[PDB]
Design a protein around this nucleic acid. Structure first.
Length: 157
RNA sequence: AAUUGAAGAGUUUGAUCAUGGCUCAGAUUGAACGCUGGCGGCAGGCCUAACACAUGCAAGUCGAACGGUAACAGGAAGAAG
């Protein structure tokens, strides 16, 4: 129903006097499949507790995304910490043409035809914040006609 | 009707985010090499020595331009078998 999807599991260290003590970080994205999407980071000492802590963070950080018939509205960009992400509406692009950690966030939002490309750093944590900054900044023709033109037949044409 | 088209990964660190190279997954070739090998179709086939070349062939034709008769096949005569 909410399409839980783990992206990456890492292994981080802390370096104490005894030695190095390890823990695990997860990155999971959830979403219904009609324009709601959220990621949660999560970290714990073992692997399945780190993924489960990511699931609880991802459910309470969902946003709203406007999509036209399972695809985007317009070409939009997204920037977060050296991760520049470009995305196209791809009018029947027929497939989520996106890279690692950019494909997974677009599968759970419900969007199906994107030509996407990630420039800069492709660190998996930062590119998920780059796409989510790109998707909620994207506006529908109903929102643009609500503030400009005052007619959806006059805004689009 | 005459284009509908854009994926990333590994590796600097105890771990991190950056920067930044290296490397890989793709397609292609007048290809070569190794192993293997049934048929057909359509193509392609000295990229190096514009190095050197045995032998054959690759530009002849026209008698309705002309003098002609070296052959060839007949004819016309002359003989004689």
């Amino acid at each position: 129903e909410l399409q839980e999807k783990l992206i990456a599991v890492n292994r981080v260290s802390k370096t104490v006097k005894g030695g190095r003590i390890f823990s695990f970080t997860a990155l999971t994205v959830v979403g219904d499949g009609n324009g709601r999407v959220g990621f949660g980071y999560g970290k714990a000492r073992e692997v399945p507790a780190a993924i489960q802590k990511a699931m609880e963070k991802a459910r309470r950080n969902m946003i709203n995304v406007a999509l036209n018939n399972g695809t985007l509205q317009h070409p939009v960009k997204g920037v977060h910490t050296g991760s520049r992400v470009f995305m196209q509406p791809a009018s029947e692009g027929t497939g989520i043409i996106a890279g690692g950690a950019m494909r997974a966030v677009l599968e759970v939002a419900g969007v199906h035809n994107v030509l996407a490309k990630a420039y800069g750093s492709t660190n998996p944590i930062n590119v998920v914040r780059a796409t989510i900054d790109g998707l909620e900044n994207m506006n529908s023709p109903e929102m643009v006609a609500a503030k400009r033109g005052k007619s959806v037949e006059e805004i689009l044409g």
